[PDB]
Amino acid sequence: VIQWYPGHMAKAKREVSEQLKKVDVVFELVDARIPYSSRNPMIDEVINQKPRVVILNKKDMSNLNEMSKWEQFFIDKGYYPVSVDAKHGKNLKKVEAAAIKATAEKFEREKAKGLKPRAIRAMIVGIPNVGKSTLINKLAKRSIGNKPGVTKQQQWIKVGNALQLLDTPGILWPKFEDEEVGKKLSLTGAIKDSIVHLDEVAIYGLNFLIQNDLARLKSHYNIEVPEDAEIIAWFDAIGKKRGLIRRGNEIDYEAVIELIIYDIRNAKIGNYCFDIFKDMTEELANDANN
């Protein structure tokens, strides 16, 4: 859990840029469930045209078809997107491979200028909880000062044959300014942080599921709901079917809300990508020119 405040943000921007000076390529790590919404809002300014691998992590909890649209978008911006499951160690070879492709031009020009071949240097950057430390540990094949008061120095990790990975990620802040994006981040657990009302988060999730996977939502909770009912009816149906009640036979809404948020965060109902590319055309255009 990280506390952002005007100064701390400045600290992170500064420090991450400093680390970026040491590397040939940057791995922007995003959540495959929201490849666009889980990006730091100033990421391009911070990365500043550095060769970039965009890593859609938690592929195991998302939808491949939607992700592929996001991959196309990343390809169209000139990045090298790959998807991985850092936790269960799936597709990890792809990281080095993309790093090699991302820096192929740079090292060709170095080779032509007569420089000797060398390890590619990389770092990982992204908002919190996307799986940065998980990915680092999986790539190091080991868990990354042991004495109180003793400061750990940032070190290079040998990964594969051609890759050197900084063992410390650049941590940047999530998008703050948009309420829908807030709900997306809350649905994925990127922010388990207040002022975005949990009840509204659960309504957003239900409505997402009702629109994209109604059959699955119903079979999961074993409920059936009138199509012209308002959203409250769904809370009531689930609350009733799970027995989450209070004061006689009133619905314990706080409890149903928590169950919905949990089941969506932890992919109990299905594997979804909440960034629907075709629905985000205006948002994309707003960001696009800068």
Ligand X SMILES: Nc1nc2c(ncn2[C@@H]2O[C@H](COP(=O)(O)OP(=O)(O)NP(=O)(O)O)[C@@H](O)[C@H]2O)c(=O)[nH]1
Give the residue numbers of the binding site for GDP. Answer: 57-58, 60, 86-87, 129-134
Partners of residue 124 on adjacent β-strands? 27
Q: How many residues does the chain have?
A: 290
Which one of residues 42, 119, 140, 171 is an interface residue with ligand X (CB under 6 A)? 171
Told to check if 86 binds ligand X by CB under 6 A, we report yes
- Select from 9, 20, 41, 60 the one that contacts ligand X (CB under 6 A): 60
Rounded Cα distance between 35 and 57, Å, is: 9
Q: Is 33 in the site for ligand X (CB under 6 A)?
A: no
- 83 SS3 class: strand
By the rule CB under 6 A, 61 interacts with ligand X: yes
Q: How far apart are CA 219 and CA 258, in angstroms?
A: 19
Binding region for ligand X (CB under 6 A) out of 114-122, 126-134, 207-215, 220-228? 126-134
Q: Which pairing describes strands 250-251 and 245-246: parallel, antiparallel, or unpaired?
A: antiparallel
Per CB under 6 A, the list member of 17, 19, 68, 134 interacting with ligand X is 134
Q: Please give the annotated binding residues, written as ranges.
A: 57-60, 86-87, 129-134, 170
Asked if 94 interacts with ligand X (CB under 6 A), we say: no
Distance of CA 184 to the CA centre of its chain: 10
Which tokens belong to 164?
């050197």
35: three-class secondary structure by DSSP: coil
Name the minimum Å distance from CB 175 to ligand X: 15
Asked if 131 touches ligand X (CB under 6 A), the answer is yes
Q: DSSP secondary-structure letter at 90?
A: B
Q: Which of 38, 62, 63, 133 binds ligand X (CB under 6 A)?
A: 133
Residue of closest CB approach to ligand X: 131
- In angstroms, the first-to-last Cα distance of the chain is 30
Contact flag: residue 71 with ligand X (CB under 6 A): no
Largest CA distance in the chain: 81
Judged by the rule CB under 6 A, the positions of this chain that interact with ligand X are: 57-58, 60-61, 85-87, 128-134, 169, 171
